[PDB]
Each structure stands twice: as C-alpha cells, then as structure tokens.
Amino acid sequence: KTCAESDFVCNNGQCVPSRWKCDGDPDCEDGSDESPEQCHMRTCRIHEISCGAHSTQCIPVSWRCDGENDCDSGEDEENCGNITCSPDEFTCSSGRCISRNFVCNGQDDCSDGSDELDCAP
Ligand SMILES: [Ca+2]
Ligand SMILES: [Ca+2]
Ligand SMILES: [Ca+2]
C-alpha cells in the first residue's frame, strides 16, 4: 500500500512517486518535496523562487525586500524580514545575529533556544 520502489520519499513522511519532483506541485504539506532533499539538484517552483539554476536553492519570495530575490548564496536577504544581519553571522530564529560559535551547539544562546530548533543532522 505504498508508492513504487523508484518512488521519491518526502520530508513530511509523505510519499510522492518520482513524477512530483520540483515542479511547482505543493504535494508535500511542508513544501519541501522540491527542496534540496528531493530536488537535490534544482529549485522549487511557485511559493518559492529560484536563486541558482546551477545549484539547489529555493526560498519563499517573501525575502524580496528590494522587489527581487537575490539569495544565490543567501547573501542579499538572509533573515531580511526580522532584522537584516550579515550572512557571515548566525541567523537567529528571530532574525538576530550572533557569532557562528553559538550555532546550535546543543545549548540555547541567541534568544531562548530556537537557535537549535530542530538543529539535528
Ligand atoms: Ca511537487
Ligand atoms: Ca531580495
Ligand atoms: Ca547553540
């Protein structure tokens, strides 16, 4: 009662045969059927724009603070909503920036703990 062997597994535990690849199809409740996990070579489509036709990078257009997404390497708008930090800093769940040394080291630090919100492998 499961997809065919060559099927592609989705990140939300959902199952989608190889034909629902990054193709603009919201089939995964978490929108990540078109992310680097399944579309590990291309970017999502609609509800997420293209930052690199040469790599796997799709993000939600909401970071177009200048009317464009320029995040080729997440440099122009990383955490552009909350606070604009410098891409060379550790993006906080609230947008804040701290030293990359506080990157989820299994210990809270930036605000409360979100700094490690599901920071597992
Ligand atoms: Ca899809
Ligand atoms: Ca932008
Ligand atoms: Ca930490």
Distance between CA 102 and CA 26 in Å, rounded? 34
Residues 55 and 15 in one domain: yes
Say which DSSP state 40 is in. Answer: B
**Quick one: 107 exposed, middle or buried, by C-beta within 10 A (0-12, 13-18, 19+)?**
exposed
Q: 17 and 63: one domain?
A: yes
Please tell me whether residues 72 and 93 are part of one structural domain.
Answer: no
Which CATH number do you get for residue 112? 4.10.400.10
CA–CA separation, 94 and 89 (whole Å): 13
Q: Which ligand is nearest to the CA of 117?
A: 3
Q: Quote the ligand 2 centre to 87 CA distance (angstroms).
A: 13
Q: Are residues 101 and 65 in the same domain?
A: no
Residues 90 and 36 both lie in one domain? no
The dihedral through the CA atoms of 93, 31, 16, 55 has a sign that is: negative
Distance between Cα 118 and ligand 3 center (Å)? 11
